Design an enzyme around this catalytic site. Structure first.
Site, mmCIF file in Angstrom:
data_model
loop_
_atom_site.group_PDB
_atom_site.id
_atom_site.type_symbol
_atom_site.label_atom_id
_atom_site.label_comp_id
_atom_site.label_asym_id
_atom_site.label_seq_id
_atom_site.Cartn_x
_atom_site.Cartn_y
_atom_site.Cartn_z
ATOM 1 N N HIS A 1 0.850 -1.200 0.000
ATOM 2 C CA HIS A 1 0.000 0.000 0.000
ATOM 3 C C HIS A 1 0.885 1.250 0.000
ATOM 4 C CE1 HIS A 1 -3.645 2.386 1.455
ATOM 5 N NE2 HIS A 1 -2.642 3.191 1.768
ATOM 6 N N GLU A 2 1.886 1.276 0.879
ATOM 7 C CA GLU A 2 2.771 2.442 0.947
ATOM 8 C C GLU A 2 3.619 2.618 -0.319
ATOM 9 O OE1 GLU A 2 1.809 4.254 3.220
ATOM 10 O OE2 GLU A 2 0.856 2.711 4.456
ATOM 11 N N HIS B 1 1.769 4.185 -3.122
ATOM 12 C CA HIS B 1 1.613 5.642 -3.100
ATOM 13 C C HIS B 1 2.718 6.291 -3.924
ATOM 14 C CE1 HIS B 1 -1.845 6.402 -0.640
ATOM 15 N NE2 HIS B 1 -1.362 5.777 0.419
ATOM 16 N N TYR C 1 -4.159 14.290 -3.087
ATOM 17 C CA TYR C 1 -4.600 13.546 -1.896
ATOM 18 C C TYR C 1 -5.745 14.206 -1.133
ATOM 19 C CZ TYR C 1 -3.746 9.913 1.665
ATOM 20 O OH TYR C 1 -3.850 8.815 2.502
ATOM 21 N N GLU D 1 -6.077 6.415 -2.619
ATOM 22 C CA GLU D 1 -6.180 5.408 -1.567
ATOM 23 C C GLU D 1 -6.602 4.028 -2.072
ATOM 24 O OE1 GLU D 1 -5.586 4.775 1.688
ATOM 25 O OE2 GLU D 1 -4.176 6.419 1.266
ATOM 26 N N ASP E 1 -10.290 13.666 7.323
ATOM 27 C CA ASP E 1 -9.550 12.681 6.532
ATOM 28 C C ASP E 1 -9.337 13.157 5.097
ATOM 29 O OD1 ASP E 1 -8.314 10.154 5.911
ATOM 30 O OD2 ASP E 1 -10.253 9.359 5.268
ATOM 31 N N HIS F 1 -9.772 7.863 2.970
ATOM 32 C CA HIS F 1 -9.717 6.476 3.444
ATOM 33 C C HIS F 1 -11.118 5.923 3.654
ATOM 34 C CE1 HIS F 1 -5.706 8.000 4.799
ATOM 35 N NE2 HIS F 1 -5.316 6.799 4.403
#
Ligand SMILES: CCC[C@H](NC(=O)[C@H](CC(C)C)NP(=O)(O)CNC(=O)OCc1ccccc1)C(=O)O
Ligand SMILES: [Ca+2]
Ligand SMILES: [Ca+2]
Ligand SMILES: [Ca+2]
Ligand SMILES: [Ca+2]
Ligand SMILES: [Zn+2]
Length: 316
Positions: free
Chosen positions: A142-143, A146, A157, A166, A226, A231
Site C-alpha cells: 500500500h505504501e 503511493h 490527496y 487510496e 480525513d 480512506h
C-alpha cells in the site's frame, strides 16, 4: 554503502523466519543490491527524524524483537518490487529503478505508516490498535504504491482524486498479498491490526461497510475530515475493484468476475495511461473502461464487467 552482497536470516513481526538480502562492509546492512538500484531499510530509533541510520547488524542474523519490523519492511519491499517488475514490467516506483528506502521504529506508539514524498515510514503501533505495521505485506505494498501513484497519475490527496489514490494503494496492496500467496484476502491490514481481536481488519474491499465505509456513491462522505474522506470513500472504488475481480450482486446489480490478474492489468493501465492528478470517480470509470477496451476489446466480457462493477457502486 559500498560492499559485497550477502544473505542474512531473521524473523519478522509475526514470528516467521525469512532470508533477507544484505550488504557487508564491516557491518551487515539492510541493503538489497539484487533489485534495481537497491532497497535500503533504516532505523528511526523511536524518533521522527528521517530517514535515520541505515540498518547495521554485527552478525547478519536478525532474530531480536527490535529487528522484526526491519526484517519485514525490507523483505516485503522486495516482494513488492518483484510484483511490479514481473507482473507489470515496471522497474521500481519511478519506472527507472529508483532506490527504495524505508524507515522503521518511527516515533513512539505510532499507529500508522506513510510515504513522505521520498520514502516509506512505519510506526511500531501502540500494541493495542497496531503491532509494527511493516508486518503487513498489504500495508508495505500500500505504501510503495503511493510512490507509484505519485510518479504516474499524481492523484491529489483529497476528495475524489484522493479516494482513488487510496483505493489504488489498497488494490495493489491486496494484489501483492495474493502474489506472495500467504493467507491472502481482500481485507486491509489484518495481519497487524488489533492483536487482541481476531478476524477484524482496518478496511474491507469485499464489504467496506463492515468497517464503516461506503460501498455506493450515494453514501459518499462529503465532509472535511480525513482529507475529504480519502480512506472512507476509497471503499466505493475498492468495492468496484473487488466486484470486477471476484464478481457478485450488489444492490441488485450483477457483475461477472474476471479475476485478479485482469483487474491488475486494467487498473495498472488506468493508473499509468489515463488517470490525472484531478481525476474524479466518473473519470476513473472512463479510464478503466478505456483500459479494458485497449487490453481485451470493446465487445469483451472484461469491458462489460468493468461497466457492471461501476454501475453496482453507483458511479456513472
Ligand atoms: C489507522 C490509519 C489509517 C489510515 N492509514 C492508512 O490507511 C495507511 C496505513 C494502513 C494501510 C495500515 N497509511 P497511509 O494511507 O499511507 C497514511 N497517509 C498519510 O499519512 O498521508 C498524509 C501525508 C503524509 C506525508 C506526506 C504527504 C501526505 C489513515 O491515515 O487514516
Ligand atoms: Ca544480529
Ligand atoms: Ca491476509
Ligand atoms: Ca490483506
Ligand atoms: Ca485484529
Ligand atoms: Zn494510503
Amino acid at each position: 554503502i559500498t560492499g559485497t552482497s550477502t544473505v542474512g536470516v531473521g524473523r519478522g513481526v509475526l514470528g516467521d523466519q525469512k532470508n533477507i538480502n544484505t550488504t557487508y562492509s564491516t557491518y551487515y546492512y539492510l541493503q538489497d543490491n539484487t533489485r534495481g538500484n537497491g532497497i535500503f531499510t533504516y532505523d528511526a530509533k523511536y524518533r521522527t527524524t528521517l530517514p535515520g541510520s541505515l540498518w547495521a547488524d554485527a552478525d547478519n542474523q536478525f532474530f531480536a524483537s527490535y529487528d522484526a519490523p526491519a526484517v519485514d519492511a525490507h523483505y516485503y519491499a522486495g516482494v513488492t518490487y518483484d510484483y511490479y517488475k514481473n507482473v507489470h514490467n515496471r522497474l521500481s516506483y519511478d519506472g527507472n529503478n529508483a532506490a527504495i528506502r524505508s524507515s522503521v521504529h518511527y516515533s513512539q506508539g505510532y499507529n500508522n505508516a506513510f510515504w513522505n514524498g521520498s520514502q516509506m515510514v512505519y510506526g511500531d503501533g501502540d500494541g493495542q490498535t497496531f503491532i509494527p505495521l511493516s508486518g503487513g505485506i498489504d500495508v508495505v505494498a500500500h505504501e510503495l504504491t503511493h510512490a507509484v501513484t505519485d510518479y504516474t497519475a499524481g492523484l491529489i490527496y483529497q476528495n475524489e482524486s484522493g479516494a482513488i489514490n487510496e483505493a489504488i494503494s489498497d488494490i495493489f496492496g491486496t494484489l501483492v498479498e495474493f502474489y506472495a500467496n500467504k493467507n491472502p484476502d481482500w481485507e486491509i491490514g489484518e495481519d497487524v491490526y488489533t492483536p487482541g481481536i481476531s478476524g477484524d481488519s482496518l478496511r474491507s474491499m469485499s464489504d467496506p461497510a463492515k468497517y464503516g465505509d461506503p460501498d455506493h456513491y450515494s453514501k459518499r462522505y462529503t465532509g472535511t475530515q480525513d482529507n475529504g474522506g480519502v480512506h472512507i470513500n476509497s471503499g466505493i472504488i475498492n468495492k468496484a475493484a473487488y466486484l470486477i475481480s471476484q464478481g457478485g450482486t450488489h444492490y441488485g446489480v450483477s457483475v461477472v468476475g474476471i479475476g485478479r490478474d485482469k483487474l491488475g492489468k486494467i487498473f495498472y493501465r488506468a493508473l499509468t495511461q489515463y488517470l490525472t492528478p484531478t481525476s474524479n470517480f466518473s473519470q476513473l470509470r472512463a479510464a478503466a473502461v478505456q483500459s479494458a477496451t485497449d487490453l481485451y476489446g470493446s465487445t469483451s466480457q472484461e469491458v462489460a464487467s468493468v461497466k457492471q462493477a461501476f454501475d453496482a457502486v453507483g458511479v456513472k
